[PDB]
Amino acid sequence: FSGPPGLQGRLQRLLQASGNHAAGILTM
Numbered sequence: 001f002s003g004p005p006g007l008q009g010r011l012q013r014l015l016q017a018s019g020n021h022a023a024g025i026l027t028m
Contacts (some may be wrong), residue, residue, distance in 0.1 A: 008014060017025040 021028075
């Protein structure tokens, strides 16, 4: 749906992961 699947992705990913589910990410 979007263009670059790495920006908002790595963003929402690194952001959500390193700003939301970092624990579920560091201990999923």
